[PDB]
Amino acid sequence: DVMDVMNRLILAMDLMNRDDALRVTGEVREYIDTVKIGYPLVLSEGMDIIAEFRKRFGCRIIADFKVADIPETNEKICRATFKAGADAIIVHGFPGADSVRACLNVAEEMGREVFLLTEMSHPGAEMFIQGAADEIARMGVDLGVKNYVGPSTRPERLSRLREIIGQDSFLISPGVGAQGGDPGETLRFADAIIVGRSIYLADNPAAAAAGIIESIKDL
Amino acid sequence: RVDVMDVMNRLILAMDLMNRDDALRVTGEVREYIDTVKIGYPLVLSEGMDIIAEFRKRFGCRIIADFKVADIPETNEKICRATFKAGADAIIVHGFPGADSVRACLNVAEEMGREVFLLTEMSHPGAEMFIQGAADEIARMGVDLGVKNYVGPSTRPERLSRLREIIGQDSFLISPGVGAQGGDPGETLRFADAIIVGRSIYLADNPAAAAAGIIESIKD
Numbered sequence: 001d002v003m004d005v006m007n008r009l010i011l012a013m014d015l016m017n018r019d020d021a022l023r024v025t026g027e028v029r030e031y032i033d034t035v036k037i038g039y040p041l042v043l044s045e046g047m048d049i050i051a052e053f054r055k056r057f058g059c060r061i062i063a064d065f066k067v068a069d070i071p072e073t074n075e076k077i078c079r080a081t082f083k084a085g086a087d088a089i090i091v092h093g094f095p096g097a098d099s100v101r102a103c104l105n106v107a108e109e110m111g112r113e114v115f116l117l118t119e120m121s122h123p124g125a126e127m128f129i130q131g132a133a134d135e136i137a138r139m140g141v142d143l144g145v146k147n148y149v150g151p152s153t154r155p156e157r158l159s160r161l162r163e164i165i166g167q168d169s170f171l172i173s174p175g176v177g178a179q180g181g182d183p184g185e186t187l188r189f190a191d192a193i194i195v196g197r198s199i200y201l202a203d204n205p206a207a208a209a210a211g212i213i214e215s216i217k218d219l
Numbered sequence: 220r221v222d223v224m225d226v227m228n229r230l231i232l233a234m235d236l237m238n239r240d241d242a243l244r245v246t247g248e249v250r251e252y253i254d255t256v257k258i259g260y261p262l263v264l265s266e267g268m269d270i271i272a273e274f275r276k277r278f279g280c281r282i283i284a285d286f287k288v289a290d291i292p293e294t295n296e297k298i299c300r301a302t303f304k305a306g307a308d309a310i311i312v313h314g315f316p317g318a319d320s321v322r323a324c325l326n327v328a329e330e331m332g333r334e335v336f337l338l339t340e341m342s343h344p345g346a347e348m349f350i351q352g353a354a355d356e357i358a359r360m361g362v363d364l365g366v367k368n369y370v371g372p373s374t375r376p377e378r379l380s381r382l383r384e385i386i387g388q389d390s391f392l393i394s395p396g397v398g399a400q401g402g403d404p405g406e407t408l409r410f411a412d413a414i415i416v417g418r419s420i421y422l423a424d425n426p427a428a429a430a431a432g433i434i435e436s437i438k439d
């Protein structure tokens with residue numbers, strides 16, 4: 001019990017225009033109830049865009065801020081993000097145990113959630129992250145982290161993440177569509193998929209999001 | 220130094236106060252001593268990206284956005300472009316996500332005529348778990364990518380020394396961890412061109428005196 005993602009599909013709203021972002025999000029609201037908001041939108045439109053998303057859509061907000069500073073600064077960032085109304089925040093694990101714990105404390109203090117990003121989906125992730133991915137995931141377990149983010153681009157790596165974090169841990173996965181990940185094969189190990197450009201750059205975002213779901217209902 | 224964009228008194232202020240009035244007031248009190256301000260997410264997320272342009276116009280200071288950019292290439296480019304649009308002169312980027320992620324930041328910086336600082340090793344205890352073991356390689360990856368500006372830990376003088384010899388004498392190196400995190404200004408400035416200082420100054424009873432005192436110990 002962590003999050004009830006409708007149709008197991010999370011929207012990565014990375015449009016950097018408020019009117020564009022609100023419009024495309026509105027066109028897939030009937031298919032998506034959980035929206036991931038990142039720095040491209042927030043830095044272009046302000047942290048207030050989170051509250052405006054909650055008010056206009058009644059959707060759950062995951063702030064993909066990939067927090068990666070020292071513990072003290074991590075706390076300030078998490079505190080500002082939750083204050084702005086984020087339900088959960090995504091946090092890098094590579095800065096180490098004390099940096100993650102700093103976020104975990106603020107999340108508990110404010111009654112919100114932390115997602116631990118263990119391994120990234122892009123090719124450069126092989127240089128440093130992939131070799132540390134297992135130990136970061138394990139670190140998360142030792143810290144009592146219940147929420148994780150893993151690479152859709154690597155189904156075998158995503159499967160290892162699942163057996164590390166356990167069956168009752170909650171797992172979401174970006175890199176579906178644009179980066180090359182397949183929706184179905186990703187949902188074999190992950191609870192929900194994150195899809196960005198395959199929806200918000202399509203001619204019809206509604207049809208795109210519906211097309212993704214219609215190839216998933218078997219799962 | 221004139222071969223690179225240097226910093227007045229080798230002192231960079233880390234302005235991590237989270238409300239506009241205090242941030243503006245403290246920075247103004249120490250403006251006579253610095254000309255470079257590092258602005259991070261604590262201030263920006265609380266007061267908006269407009270605060271970068273405001274500081275730049277009000278104080279005539281160079282702005283380094285400590286955003287520790289650490290996403291995929293595509294998203295890195297969007298973040299850097301938005302940051303430079305906000306008027307920042309430089310942006311700090313994580314190296315751990317790999318070469319393609321750093322190159323995406325470098326492209327936007329070169330396009331818009333701004334700078335990238337590569338964060339190689341962090342200054343907190345947790346940095347020893349995964350970052351330290353990769354820091355040497357991140358540093359030489361940076362050199363190979365064309366990166367000329369770096370960030371290294373003041374809390375570990377021996378690691379900072381290793382970093383300097385990897386990047387050579389021509390690269391520009393700045394270092395946080397002085398004061399609150401226990402780093403010494405003197406030993407750090409043996410390797411770094413400039414120190415980043417936050418709480419030691421901005422939480423002091425007299426921030427101006429705090430900044431002046433640090434510069435004095437640097438001066439000799």
Ligand SMILES: O=C1CCN([C@@H]2O[C@H](COP(=O)(O)O)[C@@H](O)[C@H]2O)C(=O)N1
Pocket residue numbers: 012014038064117119120121122174175176177178179194195196197198290291294
């Ligand atoms: O490893 C990671 C974590 C962050 N993300 C984030 O997930 C989102 C994916 O968007 P796309 O579906 O357009 O690839 C985007 O916001 C990106 O920054 C990754 O794609 N991979």
Ligand SMILES: O=C1CCN([C@@H]2O[C@H](COP(=O)(O)O)[C@@H](O)[C@H]2O)C(=O)N1
Pocket residue numbers: 069070073233235259285338340341342343395396397398399400415416417418419
């Ligand atoms: O490794 C790092 C990079 C980020 N920084 C940043 O540098 C600043 C340090 O200021 P303090 O003097 O208050 O520790 C603060 O903004 C922090 O987030 C580090 O301290 N260490």
Ligand SMILES: [Cl-]
Pocket residue numbers: 427428431
């Ligand atoms: Cl004074």
